[PDB]
Design a protein around this nucleic acid. Structure first.
Ligand SMILES: [Zn+2]
Ligand SMILES: [Zn+2]
Ligand SMILES: [Zn+2]
Ligand SMILES: [Zn+2]
Lengths: 82, 79
DNA sequence: TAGGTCAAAGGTCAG
DNA sequence: CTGACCTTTGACCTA
């Protein structure tokens, strides 16, 4: 076995394990990182829900981090220091 | 009653290389000694070593382990 | 405990 | 931004 490991709970992409308390791909891992660390604010240009999947994840930064939160990502598991 | 880490004040999982320390400091210590490490303060021996600013300076985190008791004599060489 | 393991959290920088 | 790779740190297990 190999190719199957974990699946990212946010966009469906692959995932090596959990990241901020939730199974995530490197894409949602760093995305969540960048946002919390930066106090980033987003806005939906469609509605509340927008579909997040590996190929359509980057369009609505607003729905993506909200889904990052509705899946259980922990803002606290983020560290700022170097 | 538990105990505190002598080197960063975090919660301790008992004693490790001569002193009551938490897993962080303990691993940090063994690795440093073992896989020969040699870091240099990015500012000046000062760095306020605590739970939180634990990792910013490794010079001060390792040298704060030695002022504690933790010795090179406590672990076996990189095997 | 020592003493490993290996998740998870750190980082970089071509895309 | 982004996300594929790369290093260090520590929560945990066992003996
Ligand atoms: Zn993802
Ligand atoms: Zn949206
Ligand atoms: Zn400590
Ligand atoms: Zn220092």
């Amino acid at each position: 076995g190999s190719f199957t490991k974990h699946i990212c709970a946010i966009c469906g992409d692959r995932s090596s394990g959990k990241h901020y308390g939730v199974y995530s791909c490197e894409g949602c891992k760093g995305f969540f990182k960048r946002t919390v660390r930066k106090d980033l604010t987003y806005t939906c240009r469609d509605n509340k829900d927008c579909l997040i999947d590996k190929r359509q994840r980057n369009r609505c930064q607003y729905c993506r981090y909200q889904k990052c939160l509705a899946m259980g990502m922990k803002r606290e598991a983020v560290q700022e220091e170097r």
